């Protein structure tokens, strides 16, 4: 299982003065940190969210972000000034940073930046560069950000070393939570005729759900999207199109790792 660590930052600038920045952090599909605009410090959303970092290492790392957040806010504002009247508020910046962990001690880090909902910029190698499709005016911002050698060297440290190291630490510390198995519960219902198999409360995400006459997998089964529950489990429904009257005979089979080979079967 390849685990992706994600730092998601979203920043809104309404006008020249007003601004908020909120962040959430994910390891796979589990939230590990929240950092809202209102809060001076980064919140742990899991007991093991500090990973294997000492207190001193964490304090020094948080402090770096604390400065980054304030600095980022102003730099966007000065960039908007530098570009105007080409670009103007409201503005939405999103960042997606982190690493993907692989078997052995291999990994891969990324830092992607979105402007008004379009991916435009990334950190790659030693510098910022625009990705294909990006407007040319971004070349001024990029040139300016690349002048800052201090920021460059730090971001290279974060992506090349801090991320992988830290996530290895997170994977050890949070193993119990990551490997948890929660059993799904299912129930049935119809609607105008369409049949619905409700599966909810399962962890982890991979699940098998099919409509069945006896043991002939109905080809017509349509899976919905995976919808989350608050308690960090999943919900999913499979719908089957039918002619009224022919419901009797149909059953719902549900396979999931938590069931330990004891598939849930639910006849109508």
């Amino acid at each position, epitope marked *: 299982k390849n685990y992706t660590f994600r730092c998601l930052q979203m920043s809104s600038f309404a006008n020249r003065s007003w601004s908020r920045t909120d962040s959430v952090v994910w390891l796979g599909d589990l939230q590990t940190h929240r950092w809202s605009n209102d809060s001076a410090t980064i919140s742990f959303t899991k007991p093991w969210s500090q990973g294997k970092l000492s207190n001193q290492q964490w304090e020094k790392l948080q402090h770096m972000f604390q400065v980054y957040r304030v*600095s980022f806010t102003r730099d966007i504002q*000065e*960039l908007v000034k530098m570009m105007s009247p080409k670009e103007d508020y409201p503005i939405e910046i999103q960042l997606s940073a982190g690493c993907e962990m692989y078997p052995g001690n291999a990994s891969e880090s990324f830092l992607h930046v979105a402007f008004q909902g379009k991916y435009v910029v990334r950190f790659w190698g030693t510098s910022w560069q625009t990705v294909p499709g990006a407007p040319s005016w971004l070349d001024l911002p990029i040139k*300016v950000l690349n002048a800052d050698q201090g920021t460059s060297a730090t971001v290279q440290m974060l992506l090349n070393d801090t991320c992988p190291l830290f996530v290895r630490g997170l994977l050890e510390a949070g193993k119990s939570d990551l490997e948890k198995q929660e059993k799904p519960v299912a129930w049935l219902s119809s609607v105008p005729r369409q049949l619905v198999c409700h599966v909810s409360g399962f962890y982890p995400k991979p699940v098998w759900v099919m409509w069945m006459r006896g043991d002939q997998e109905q080809q017509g089964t349509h899976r919905g999207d995976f919808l989350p529950n608050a308690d960090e489990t999943w919900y999913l429904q499979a719908t089957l199109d039918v002619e009224a009257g022919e419901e009797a005979g149909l059953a719902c089979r549900v396979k999931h790792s938590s069931l330990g080979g004891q598939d849930i079967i639910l006849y109508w």
Partner: T-cell receptor
Amino acid sequence: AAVTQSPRNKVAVTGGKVTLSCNQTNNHNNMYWYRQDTGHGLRLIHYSYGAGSTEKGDIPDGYKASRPSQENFSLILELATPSQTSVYFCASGDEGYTQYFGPGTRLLVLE
Amino acid sequence: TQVEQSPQSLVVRQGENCVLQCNYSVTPDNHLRWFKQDTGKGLVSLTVLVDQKDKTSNGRYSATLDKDAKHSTLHITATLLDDTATYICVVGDRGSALGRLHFGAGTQLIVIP
């Protein structure tokens, strides 16, 4: 990489218009205006990221800025007052951190 | 005012060495620069320090910077009469043009010939 200011010295009356000028031939996008008052450091009045753009600094009140071109940044005092007696410094720079400073301009505004 | 210099002023005999302090609260502190200013004149750069713990020299001028302490000093060796000037400490909050500079009020030096 040189920067010039004119006039280098100016005596003016209250309510008068004073224009302070800065010329820079280094093709620097960025220009800055400061005043120096004894017992303070230099303080930022206005600044500019390019032709046609001007921006307020920390102490912008009483001053208006004008950037007609890449080479000229100009500090305009519409209605001069004694409190604007000072020494004014102009600076320029590119994308990097260094600002290159002019030689200064002394202003005295008399009643 | 986030940049404080010490002493306010000092008087020194030609040939003697002197030391000037700068202490700041600027955040972040990308770099610190020392300027020399003769009365009636512009700002001439003596040195710029950029590393977390940094040392530099320029002739009879030398300087240290310690960013954890947010503290810098300027050493003038064997003062000459022309050293008579105000010495100005400046901290820049960015490694690029996006930064603001934060100026000290200066230290006034007088060298007695």
